[PDB]
Write an enzyme that holds these catalytic residues in place. Structure first.
Site: not given
Ligand SMILES: *[C@@H]1O[C@H](CO)[C@@H](O)[C@H](O)[C@H]1NC(C)=O
Ligand SMILES: *[C@@H]1O[C@H](CO)[C@@H](O)[C@H](O)[C@H]1NC(C)=O
Ligand SMILES: *[C@@H]1O[C@H](CO)[C@@H](O)[C@H](O)[C@H]1NC(C)=O
Ligand SMILES: *[C@@H]1O[C@H](CO)[C@@H](O)[C@H](O)[C@H]1NC(C)=O
Length: 263
Positions: A179, A133, A60, A210
């Site tokens: 994360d 992700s 994202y 992440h």
């Protein structure tokens, strides 16, 4: 049996940890993306036979830069790899899955397109999915919806549902210990634990944020070895890679390792 999909020299830990595989890589920008925002195709010039295709989707807000390092790394071992930008940087996992599969469709289309650099280079029956992700969640949605995919290897995946019990595709989950966007305990590990029907593996990078498997990560030798070994083993049915694909790296850089039904 003779494996018609086996490509390249017999692998070693050194050959798989190296920055580059055996094949020379070239790339092109997709002129008219079909069902996604933009794409870069990476391909080996000298693989010696047709090779499978892998489509990789960012997270994202993110773009091809976040996942680009996989393009040359995988293509140099004998794959056609498309890294995409989504229609919107704010697309969600279902949309990312649709766009990933559109990218695989366009790569397969270009195998039949005489003007394309990948004309006759692709085996359209052997495909894989990767992504970061929400693009990792999208990869798992792609696998769930298209069980003829031969392998999935998402990184720090997220989806609104962790239940991927329908997935029968061999799936390697890269996870990042620290994360804080998609915590391992609420995302990657529930996803991993949901999958009961497949060959599967979980590899958590110790201390990772992440972005721990993204371009510019400091663990490219291990992460690249595992990604290439998983794709070779399952996209090419290449049992030369069975031990690389299934082994615990027994590594001080790995905070968690799990595997099941691996051969
Ligand atoms: C991505 O945009 C293209 C072009 O408008 C469109 O064909 C495709 O349906 C879009 N995909 C999604 C999943 O919204
Ligand atoms: C890709 O094209 C080549 C050369 O035309 C062909 O030999 C090969 O079978 C094609 N791939 C698929 C999967 O049909
Ligand atoms: C996942 O979905 C399956 C299919 O409905 C269901 O049987 C199972 O309980 C769910 N699994 C988990 C791990 O919650
Ligand atoms: C991990 O250790 C086991 C048991 O000693 C071994 O079989 C396996 O080869 C090891 N992994 C690596 C990368 O050496």
């Amino acid at each position: 049996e003779f494996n018609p999909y086996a490509r390249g020299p017999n692998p070693t830990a050194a050959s798989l940890e190296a920055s580059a595989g055996p094949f020379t890589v070239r790339s092109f920008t997709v002129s008219r993306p079909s069902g996604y925002g933009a794409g870069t195709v990476y391909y080996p010039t000298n693989a010696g036979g047709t090779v499978g295709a892998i489509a990789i989707v960012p997270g994202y807000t993110a773009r091809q830069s976040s996942i680009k390092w996989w393009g040359p790394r995988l293509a140099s071992h004998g794959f056609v790899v498309i890294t995409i930008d989504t229609n919107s940087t704010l697309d969600q996992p279902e949309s990312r899955s649709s766009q990933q599969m559109a990218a695989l469709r366009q790569v397969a289309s270009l195998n039949g397109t005489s003007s394309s650099p990948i004309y006759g280079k692709v085996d359209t029956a052997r495909m894989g999915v990767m992504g970061w992700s929400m693009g990792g969640g999208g990869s798992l949605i792609s696998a769930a919806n298209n069980p003829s995919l031969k392998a999935a290897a998402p990184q720090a995946p997220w989806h609104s549902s962790t239940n991927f019990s329908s997935v029968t595709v061999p799936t390697l989950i890269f996870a990042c210990e620290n994360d804080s966007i998609a915590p391992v305990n609420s995302s990657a590990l529930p996803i991993y634990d949901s999958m009961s029907q497949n060959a599967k593996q979980f590899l958590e990078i110790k201390g990772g944020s992440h972005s721990c498997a993204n371009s510019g990560n400091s663990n490219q030798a291990l992460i690249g070895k595992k990604g290439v070994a998983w794709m070779k083993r399952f996209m090419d049915n290449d049992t030369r890679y069975s031990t690389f694909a299934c082994e615990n790296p027994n590594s001080t850089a790995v905070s968690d390792f799990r595997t099941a039904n691996c051969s």
